Design a protein around this ligand. Structure first.
Ligand SMILES: N[C@H]1CC(C(=O)N2CCn3c(nnc3C(F)(F)F)C2)=CC[C@@H]1c1cc(F)c(F)cc1F
Lengths: 726, 726
């Protein structure tokens, strides 16, 4: 009876998940924006007042993109004229509304085209970056102070990241860090002077007569990297009869010997800052811990508080060296590091001792450290049930490591096997956010005894709409390959039957530290293919996968495009023998790294796959950026790893494409995986006489995410898959 | 039973057309460039001797791309290291070989990366262009004199054209004209200082890490044009210690009041040179006739000797004003101009006499003047049988316009209705090149009494091969659209049967002066479509068509993308009324101007067409170059023709594409019709929710002519057309 989950449902978002996005302002209260207005909720009893009315900015005269209330509660920052840049960066215009005098501030305002804005963490100081320089407002209405004067477009970046650091190291545009009480402002400076430029056409609106050339400083594998410097400025000190002084913190020597990155900054106290540096050979990271010296106004990083973190089987950290969490007095800290067995667990450090003590252990991993009190450390792990694709909140007693309590495992085990958390200021309360296998569910809790205070959002409205429709189901399980287990998921059509022979789509990513087999509830394209088209959508986590230990994660070290593509092939082979797959109708698709894998798979001449789709794929590693590629690949020199760089290209496997149907898709303004990469694929297929299907997206980037390009691409891909199977 | 003409046959060139390319070297002899060696032939008796053996340069140590013999017979120029630039331009290395001494010359060689090289018309003087400057060698082994010192890559060009003059005015890279006895060298200089640059990516070999951005000075419609200068130098008066003096010929008055072009130079005598200038509004041209003055050493162009050639209905010339052919004494000349009836005919001028006397007339046109003796003018025209798509050689007695003899009409009216010609130096002999409707035939004739000396090539080998294969036929005919007759041709499958119903593919160009209905014999993609797939391939010469008078050709003046697109629709409509077309299977395809028209038709909302293919289309006129675009459109200003520039875009019709299957193909390295143009089409189609097929060809240009790309594009188009008609 009734109906399915359609393409148009997915593209028109007819079945929306409800969220409960909150913002902790104190230990006791939080804000809760809506489609209208901003409320302040008391966490204990759940009573609310209106923080400010939805109508307040009717005659503002600009579409407001986001809000930001000063930790003070005294000012609201209004973001508008939002213009997207890279994955994290953008520029916008800013106004400040003064909640005491209920008037907009009109004097000395933050200039348009501003790159980043941040409140100090306690009162209402402001720091913004505009034209690659740093400015500080001590009051919102007063003239700002110039911290920095050397900023130059595409050359010098103060307090913001360049392209590569944005994407690959900080996962943010922001490169500044206030001290806890706002006294100091730490910031990084990047220098792109020597970095070569990727150049591509941007066509813009029809009315643009000549295409423009976008040029961005982008170091491909083995090219010249940006260099970096670090500074701390005192924001109380700033008079303005002269340059307020940035004090550089350099080094350390083991890093200054050659090429290096700044990979983490984390304040420890009002007067102690930590920095992690990482070698270009992403093998070796050093953490420095630096104290403010009242007797000179300098910062001293006592070697002795230096901590060295390294790996002999791979790279350091999941994507980068993990961040420390400091005990209040700042004399000790906790960070997730790799076990002796290769499993990631929490290690406890004294700042001036080199040996840490592991406080958790076992054949599972700590995903993240979430909060720290005097008595407890709260963390997320995939321990429960030994399933690497589930997430739960635990606490551990600082007094005694033997005593660990799961806080989410038991709350609703059939609906909720994947959690994230959001603690109030001193961790007096926390909000749990369950994201599957059932419908997302949000709850409030008080830490004193972990009492569930109330349900915030249960998605009941969505629940009701979904049973007028034949939804698919999700199977999360594993298989065993030469000893080890490897998990997979499958999105099964309604009314599944293990006797019938369904067509199967292998949905792939398979990047280092990837996980495609999890318990998250998703409403996506795969949901349509299963629900309406009766295709099984499968994903497999094989060698190179994450959150299961380095033995599995580091198996592709120096060797991208080997085991992880293999295991995807083997996975399919294993999938068809399961008896409900039509081994004549097996397809495969990937975006990004997944695009690459798909391409490498469809090019292996295994005969297992009939067709496939690669969307913005990498095609050879030398085309991709230094930080990501070299992490896993080393340098493309004959001395280091050049031979494997040359053996792991898509185009070298052009001939085997004669045996499959292939669709190749790429946005023309892709700053990330440049259109170059697909341009070289097509050329090699052409040069060898292989027919294939193609589609460019003009002025689209790696996301292919504008409203119309998103619709068009999934439409086009659906047609291709249906045709390949029907 | 027995084979058809297949796609492989077309792609692998199984059925080859033999040619007979000869190169005259006197009034009496030609060279016959074999794959082996070069023979010299006596045109009277047909006997030959070896000119040089295949193994003469066996150990030159380089592949030889082309040869060129001094009018002397004493020196061969050898072209090697050929590197293509645009449609005509290239660089090469040159060596000179002494024919008498049978020796290479090793001293003072022409440099590598030479842009253009030309012998003088009588002796063995050389003029070459290297790094944008002109040099002259009186003798192959003597140092060059540098004529010019201003050359600058992309800015000043002496003796060679820039992008737009190469493609749109001169149809060559060469911009230098020796006087008849080699005494004077005349040349143009182009300045592109202010010409905006088109930029695009060139990907190159896999091994190139970062794409290069190719940039070329290219004026789009309404942009700053190159400015031009003309100079004459006496090549008998150069001193090797003193700079050569160039004498400028400026103006004229009617041109200098605005932007203008130089569109023709033709020497009249040893001391009289003719120049035609064209205003940027290509309505108005002026011929200057300039005399050397011995006393002053200058050139004087007498207003009184200048001839105006203008148009009230359109532009001047078919593409450009025609070239004059001067009488012996240089005091009169013949050139083709438009009638009072708007028909192109040969007019006889006296140099100081403003009015000319037409020497031909009627409802047909002279295509070109081929040779002028003191006695006769030999021209090609389409008079015979009133067929605009046919070509014959005529001679007209200069003392009596009554006596016009067709030299080709009657030779073989069954096989040969399309002729071109190659005269020996004083027109003592001529080769006739018949190109259809039967197989190409090449014959030699003597002018004295128009005797048919002998058959040179009759393609009998091809003939024997084609009887074992089901070949399509060809109909050439006309329909009537209110009063006027309009010609079409159809490529008809073998065993064509008017009672059956075939799918139709409209093959379109339909540019200003285009001719797609003719009698030429061709073995192409259409041959396969008809022969193997049973598809009728039709082409129609509608409004804007050439060779039928201005009433038809000027119908689209200032109005591109109207009548020519409408008539293409009318044509398909009329082919269905004929009874043998399935009107559920009508398609349209075109390259270049044909791409624009195809695209404009598909987006017309007429519903006649199920599908179509656009290869490298223009999409809006502001994107195309000034010289071609403005000739037909005027300037894109409110004061001139902006509204229609804006009304005739492909992207404003995107909505109407919901009704068609569309295929969009473009080379990424297209210098001519920029990828931009298709980039904007697909963007508009995505914005409106229309699914369609696309294909880019990396590093391919407007020709998409490299061996592998050619095979790939036609394979891809074939599948698409097969899918549409299945
Ligand atoms: N440029 C890379 C950035 C990146 C990263 O550093 N991430 C994100 C994913 N990520 C991170 N931390 N934690 C988590 C998550 F939890 F999601 F696993 C940081 C991951 C993969 C990105 C990538 C790789 C690739 F091969 C492409 F072709 C394209 C592309 F965007």
């Amino acid at each position: 009876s009734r109906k399915t989950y359609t393409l148009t449902d997915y593209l028109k978002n007819t079945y929306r998940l409800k969220l409960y996005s909150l913002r902790w302002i104190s230990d006791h209260e939080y804000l809760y924006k809506q489609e209208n207005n901003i409320l302040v909720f008391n966490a204990e009893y759940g009573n609310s007042s209106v923080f400010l009315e939805n109508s307040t900015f009717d005659e503002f005269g600009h579409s407001i993109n986001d809000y930001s209330i000063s930790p003070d509660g005294q000012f609201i920052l209004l973001e508008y004229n939002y213009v997207k840049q890279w994955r994290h960066s953008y520029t916008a215009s800013y106004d400040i509304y003064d909640l005491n005098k209920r008037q907009l501030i009109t004097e000395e305002r933050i200039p348009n085209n501003t790159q980043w804005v941040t409140w100090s963490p306690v009162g209402h100081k402001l720091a913004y970056v505009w034209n690659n320089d740093i400015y500080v407002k001590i009051e919102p209405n007063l003239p700002s102070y110039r911290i920095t004067w050397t900023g130059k477009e595409d050359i010098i970046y103060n307090g913001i990241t360049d392209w590569v650091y944005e994407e690959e190291v900080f996962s943010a545009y922001s490169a500044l860090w206030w001290s806890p009480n706002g006294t100091f402002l730490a910031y990084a400076q990047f220098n792109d002077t020597e970095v070569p430029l990727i150049e591509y056409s941007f066509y813009s609106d029809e009315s643009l007569q000549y295409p423009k050339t976008v040029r961005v400083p982008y170091p491909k594998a083995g090219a010249v990297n940006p260099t970096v410097k670090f500074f701390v400025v005192n924001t109380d000190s700033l008079s303005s009869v002269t340059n307020a002084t940035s004090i550089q913190i350099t080094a350390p020597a083991s890093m200054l010997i050659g090429d290096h990155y700044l990979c983490d900054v984390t304040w420890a106290t009002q007067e102690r800052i930590s920095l992690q540096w990482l070698r270009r050979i992403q093998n070796y990271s050093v953490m420095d811990i630096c104290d403010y010296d009242e007797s000179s106004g300098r910062w001293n990083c006592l070697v002795a508080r230096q901590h060295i973190e390294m790996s002999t089987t791979g790279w350091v950290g999941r994507f980068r060296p993990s961040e420390p969490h400091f005990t209040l007095d700042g004399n000790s800290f906790y960070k997730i590091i790799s076990n002796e067995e290769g499993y990631r667990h929490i290690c406890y450090f004294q700042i001036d001792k080199k040996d840490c003590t592991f406080i958790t252990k076992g054949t599972w991993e700590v995903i993240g450290i979430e909060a720290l009190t005097s008595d407890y450390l709260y963390y997320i792990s995939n321990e429960y049930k030994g399933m690497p694709g589930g997430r739960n909140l635990y606490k551990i007693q600082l007094s005694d490591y033997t005593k660990v309590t799961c806080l989410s495992c038991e709350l609703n085990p059939e609906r909720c096997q994947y959690y994230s958390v959001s603690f109030s200021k001193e961790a007096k309360y926390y909000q749990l956010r369950c994201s599957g296998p059932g419908l997302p569910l949000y709850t409030l809790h008080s830490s004193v005894n972990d009492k569930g205070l109330r349900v915030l959002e249960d998605n009941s409205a969505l629940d009701k709409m979904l049973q007028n429709v034949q939804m698919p189901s999700k199977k999360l399980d594993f298989i065993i390959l030469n000893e080890t287990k490897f998990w997979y998921q499958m999105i099964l059509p309604p009314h599944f039957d293990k006797s019938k022979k369904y067509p199967l789509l292998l949905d792939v990513y398979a990047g280092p530290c990837s996980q495609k087999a999890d318990t998250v509830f998703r409403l996506n394209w795969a949901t349509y293919l299963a629900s309406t088209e009766n295709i099984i959508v499968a994903s497999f986590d094989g060698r190179g996968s994450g959150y299961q230990g380095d033995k599995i994660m580091h198996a592709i070290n120096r060797r991208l495009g080997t085991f992880e593509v293999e295991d995807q092939i083997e996975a399919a082979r294993q999938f068809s023998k399961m008896g409900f797959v039509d081994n004549k109708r097996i397809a495969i698709w990937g975006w990004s790294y997944g695009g690459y894998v798909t391409s490498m798979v469809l090019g292996s001449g295994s005969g297992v796959f009939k067709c496939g789709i690669a969307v913005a794929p990498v095609s050879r590693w030398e085309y991709y950026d230094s930080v990501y590629t070299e992490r896993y690949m080393g340098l493309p020199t004959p001395e280091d790893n050049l031979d494997h760089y040359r053996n792991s290209t898509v185009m070298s496997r052009a001939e085997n494409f004669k045996q499959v149907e292939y669709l190749l898709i790429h946005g023309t303004a892709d700053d990330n995986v440049h259109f170059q990469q697909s341009a070289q694929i097509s050329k090699a297929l052409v040069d060898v006489g292989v027919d294939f299907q193609a589609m460019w997206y003009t002025d689209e980037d790696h996301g292919i995410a504008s409203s119309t390009a998103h619709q068009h691409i999934y439409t086009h891909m659906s047609h291709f898959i249906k045709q390949c199977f029907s």
